Paper text:
In the IsPadC system, the bacteriophytochrome module is linked to a diguanylyl cyclase (DGC) effector and controls formation of the bacterial second messenger cyclic-dimeric-GMP by red light. In IsPadC, structural rearrangements at the dimer interface modulate the conformation of the coiled-coil sensor-effector linker and thereby regulate DGC activity. More precisely, the coiled-coil sequence of the linker region adopts two conformational registers leading to either DGC activation or inhibition. In bacterial phytochromes the bilin chromophore is covalently linked via a thioether linkage to a conserved cysteine residue located in the N-terminal extension (NTE), an α-helix preceding the N-terminal Period/ARNT/Single-minded (PAS) domain.
Addressing the structural implications of the stimulating register 2 conformation was enabled by the crystallization of IsPadCReg2 under dark conditions. Solving the crystal structure by molecular replacement (MR) using data to 2.85 Å was only possible after splitting the dark-state wild-type IsPadC structure into individual subdomains, due to substantial structural rearrangements of the overall IsPadCReg2 structure compared to the wild-type. Therefore, the IsPadCReg2 structure features an asymmetric dimer that is composed of one Pfr biliverdin environment (protomer A) and one Pr environment (protomer B). In addition to the helical tongue and the ZZEssa biliverdin configuration, also the side chains of residues Y168, H193 and F195 in the proximity of the rotated D-ring change their rotamer positions as described for other phytochrome Pfr states. Refolding of the tongue hairpin provides the structural flexibility for the PHY domain of chain A to reposition relative to chain B resulting in pronounced rearrangements at the PHY dimer interface. This repositioning of the PHY dimer correlates with the structural rearrangements of the coiled-coil to populate the register 2 conformation. Interestingly, the hinge-like rearrangement at the central helical spine of the phytochrome module breaks the Arg327-Asp494 salt bridge at the PHY interface. The quasi-translational reorientation of the coiled-coil register extends to the very end of the sensor-effector linker, which is directly linked to the strictly conserved DXLT motif of DGCs. Overall we observe a rotational movement of the DGC protomer linked to the repositioned coiled-coil linker helix. This leads to an opening of the DGC dimer at one side and a closing at the other side. In fact, the relative position of the two catalytic GGEEF sites at the center of the DGC dimer is affected by the asymmetric rearrangements in IsPadCReg2 and the net effect is a shortened distance between the GGEEF sites potentially facilitating the contact between the C3 ribose hydroxyl group of one GTP and the alpha phosphate group of the respective other GTP molecule.
Author numbering:
A (entry chain B): 8 to 337, 340 to 360, 369 to 390, 395 to 408, 415 to 424, 435 to 682
B (entry chain A): 10 to 335, 337 to 410, 415 to 427, 432 to 443, 462 to 682
The structure:
Amino acid sequence: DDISKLIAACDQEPIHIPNAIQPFGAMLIVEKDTQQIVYASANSAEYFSVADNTIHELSDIKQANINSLLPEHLISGLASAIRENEPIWVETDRLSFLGWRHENYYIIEVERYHVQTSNWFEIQFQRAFQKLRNCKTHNDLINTLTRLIQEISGYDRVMIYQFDPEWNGRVIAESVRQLFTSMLNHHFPASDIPAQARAMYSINPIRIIPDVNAEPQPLHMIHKPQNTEAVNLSSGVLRAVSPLHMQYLRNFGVSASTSIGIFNEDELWGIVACHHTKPRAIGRRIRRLLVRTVEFAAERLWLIHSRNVERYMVTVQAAREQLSTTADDKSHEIVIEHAADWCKLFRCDGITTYGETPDQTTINKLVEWLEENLFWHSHMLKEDAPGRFAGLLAIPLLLFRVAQNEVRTWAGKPEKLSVETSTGTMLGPRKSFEAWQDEVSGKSQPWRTAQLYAARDIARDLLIVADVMQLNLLNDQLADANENLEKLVSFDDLTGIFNRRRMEDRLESEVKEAQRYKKQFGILLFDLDKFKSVNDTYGHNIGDQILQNTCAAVSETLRDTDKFGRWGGEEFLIIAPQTGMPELMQLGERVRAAVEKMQHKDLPAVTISIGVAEFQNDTRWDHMIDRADKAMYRAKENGRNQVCS
Amino acid sequence: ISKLIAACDQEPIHIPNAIQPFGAMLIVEKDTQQIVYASANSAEYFSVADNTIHELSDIKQANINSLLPEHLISGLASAIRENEPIWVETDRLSFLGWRHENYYIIEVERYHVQTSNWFEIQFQRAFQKLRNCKTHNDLINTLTRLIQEISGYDRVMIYQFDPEWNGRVIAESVRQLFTSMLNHHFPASDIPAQARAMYSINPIRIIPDVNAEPQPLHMIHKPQNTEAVNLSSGVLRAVSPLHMQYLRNFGVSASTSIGIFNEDELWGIVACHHTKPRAIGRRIRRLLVRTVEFAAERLWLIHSRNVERYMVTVQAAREQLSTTADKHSSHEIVIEHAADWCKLFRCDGIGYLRGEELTTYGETPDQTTINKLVEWLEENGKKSLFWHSHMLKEDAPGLLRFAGLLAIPLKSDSYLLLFRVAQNETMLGPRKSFEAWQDEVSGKSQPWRTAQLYAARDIARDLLIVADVMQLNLLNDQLADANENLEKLVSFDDLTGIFNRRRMEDRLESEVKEAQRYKKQFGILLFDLDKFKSVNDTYGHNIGDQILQNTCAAVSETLRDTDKFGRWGGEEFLIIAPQTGMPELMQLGERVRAAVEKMQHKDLPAVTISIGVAEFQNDTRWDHMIDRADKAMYRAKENGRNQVCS
Ligand SMILES: *C/C=C1/C(=C/c2[nH]c(/C=C3[NH+]=C(/C=C4/NC(=O)C(C=C)=C4C)C(C)=C\3CCC(=O)O)c(CCC(=O)O)c2C)NC(=O)[C@H]1C
Ligand SMILES: *C/C=C1/C(=C/c2[nH]c(/C=C3[NH+]=C(/C=C4\NC(=O)C(C=C)=C4C)C(C)=C\3CCC(=O)O)c(CCC(=O)O)c2C)NC(=O)[C@H]1C
Ligand SMILES: [Cl-]
Ligand SMILES: [Cl-]
């Protein structure tokens, strides 16, 4: 647009080489090699006449010698300087000199000066420093800075102007003695300080305009220089002001100004702006006191910001420990317990949902577009199909910010003014600074890096905890399946007692022990009597029901050492360790009587015939089963329901 | 001198009732406005305000308005806060006064106007140079050099206090007119609590001449309160003769020191020694203190940004652990990164124990000692908590070289340890002091600063988690692998590779239900080996079992694909034949019985089966069918073996 073109044209004016100065001093430019005064400001006579009573008009300077004009210390100091743009301050009783070396030149600015002897500045320094050290908060620091600067400088209005990333500004603190309207929280456009001017603070942190209506004095050529290109003046204070900005200050109701740049390392963070409603000069000592105060206040402010980051990281670690304590006691469960805390942690509105969120369907459309296209974070990109909501940080392996329309007050409505300057046609300054409002529909707060990494860390721990609940559940269920399939391999489905295999194993180990340690044990091998008659007359279901009954009757009779299992078909085995043949036969009698006398329960009466064997220094368990077996068979021959050895 | 060293810590240095002679002092009662004390040399300074003051006694005739400026009196009258000195100058005299309880204390010094920009230039240069420092080191060295350039003192040092109030000289700027003091430590006893506390009242202390004769306070008029007045808010307060002697033994004739405050905490001191007496005016004092104050705020900003970079480092390490896990073991990860963790935790060694495995890096005791430590922790009951010490020999007595230990307990289905090496490398003096400090840190490790501890619990948290995940994943792989084998054992038979008893009960039950839904027709064939006990006992188990395998091999080739064939009990088998009526069912039974008869003997006996057969006859339970097929099987067995019966 034509606006953009006009604002860009401001950069054409070379504000560092205006070949003129403000008239609150005088300036000489001297060629180092020839030691010849090559430039003098039109007002040089009225200052250097004090050094040289032969100086009457400007033209007399051409006839003068610099040793007649400069103090001894300034001359030696300029000769000694190898580094460029390092001003040297040297005073007489009536003049105050600031000189520096720039390429081939020495630039010397001189101001009239009165000697003034007191501890005022030292007391100011101690008090300002103590008051800034006492600030614990961004707010307290910036307001303390505004009051300190106003009291030191005496300016009618003092502001803290903070730059945003696009170089627009907001006034964040203010102190206004006389009747002025409050510019507090007013926004200013980037055009108001072009890049070329913001760049000045890096050469000299203070800029002084003691009189917006003072007539600039141009530099006149005295002797001819070997190079006629304009000399850079930006290191001093006397450099002339772009009439655009003189007019800007006029339109602002300001008659004199001073500003100091606020630097975070090499970055211009903002400025301290000082307006006065009548002309006002400030001496070199008040200037130094100002810049030192802003520099001490800035280090303090950055320290305050840095401590805020530490406090926030402590909160993040308290959150990650809280998450860890909850997961051990009880993953969406984890999300529900702490989300009110997390909303503070992440300065977000919505978080399975909590706080302000889209409905499940819109949330799934969100998810889906991310699946189509790490985390993702932005405030109202509008790069998708809208669902109210403007900020989203989504870690799929969701954090929501509602749009927050922000009314901004500007210091004047914009104007597309044109002005004809020397360097071309460019934007003229707005005529009104009256308050004027816009708002940003559809944007959210930007994501701070500290919040970003806290969020990536909370999501990382959550994913791990879901994985651990997972693996623990799968271990519980595979362990349960292994429990069932291991019971099925060892026991018999019907009767729920050791199958043949487990009885062979137990019997084998009882034999090995008894052979190793000379222990005594015996086995009981019994069978159900006339069982086929039960099966054919009553059926297998009734017969199997009898097998279950008989197992229940046998298991209640046995001692804790004995092991009881199903050997084959309707044959069962009992292993009685630490039992001699007498008590062994006794156990066979109690068992035999137990199966006879059990409850019939609408089923036939049942009898078992038991053979018995004793450990007789045997090698293998197979022999013992044979003895108990043929013994059982003699029990079958003498009439069933018997115990035989 | 020794008798004084016996009781130096108790000495009340704030109330010596004397001043150093680089000025004079008046003490005035606030209410009556009477001079009640004057320093013994008061005549020579106040003779300047009042040329009638000849001896000290003339002060008794004086009125405070005759000696003090109007600005000083009104400023004192308006002050409600105590101990905030007020600086007021005349053409010949320089006044500092403050209110303390009942009194106004006024210190006065002779004074000379400096008309020059020397101070503003010095200050700007100091600020620029400190602002250029990006590191702790650069800042402390720049500050020592600047303080020397401003104060003019032959030697300038920065003492940093440790948590126990010991001090270390960490920067120095010294003409070789003195010996180098860099890295010397002094014990906390060398600056008593009362002397460290004075910096909070006045940040600067000046001793222009160790050999100047102190001037006592004399009573001028009588005070309503007879107790000694506290003088600590000014600069003239007299110096403990013990410490004057300390500086004498050191070759120091004058000193200045400034406190370095982190908020209200005394972090260290800027000490300035000179080899001959040396005065410093009020403007140089203020310039010095302002410089230390700007430098201190800078240093705290540098430390705070270092904390930020350290937390970024910790987070980069915990992500690295997660990247490394993707190794087969937990001890594999520890071996790869423990040197980084030693940097991360500022410790000399680490040991990780997990079940039967032990890993060490750096300086550690041998494995056995590590087991004595573990056991002693789990014995004290202190195992479950975190535990840490910077003095093992006194905290954990009797475990003999190493001095620091941080032990993180880890619990699953079990430790991470950090080891730190001890610190090692009668006239008053810094040689006795440096060996006094050696005694205080004997067996004491560097204390565990808090930022490293939480780095350790957080690194350990991920270690326990990743070890647990490798564990649970391996154990789940093993439980899943075994269940396949135990599922082969539950559904199949050991010797025949054919369905178990269970699988035939289940198949039969489900076949009955299925036939019950669609009124479909199926039958079962129940066969047995004939005189098999006689075969087993005549030929043995090896031959007999191979016969069972032979018979299963022969039958499986007989079956149709729909039929299900399983081993029912002992030597009894079942065939479930879907889509088969009783005629075709009997046909299948004859083919099966004949199939088992003609098989290869292979030097083994001839074998025959007897088959019962049953058909689905509107049955409820699989029980009824087994009974029917069973009685049929028995009629075949009874009527001459090798038969099929319905
Ligand atoms: C038990 C009390 C003692 C004591 C008292 C005392 N000291 C000071 C001032 C000191 N003393 C310092 C001690 C040092 N330790 C060292 O290793 C070195 C060597 C470089 C020194 C100097 C010390 C550092 C200070 C302050 C700074 C300075 O160096 O000046 C005071 C305060 C004096 C006052 O002005 O009131 C007291 C009371 N001195 C001890 O040595 C022990 C015995
Ligand atoms: C096309 C060029 C434009 C232009 C030029 C311009 N502006 C400056 C200097 C300043 N502008 C400032 C702006 C503010 N002053 C305030 O008090 C506030 C309130 C918060 C703002 C936003 C400031 C502070 C300066 C510095 C000078 C000063 O301190 O007063 C210059 C450079 C001036 C110089 O030193 O030569 C130039 C060239 N401004 C535009 O509006 C357009 C027209
Ligand atoms: Cl200046
Ligand atoms: Cl002082």
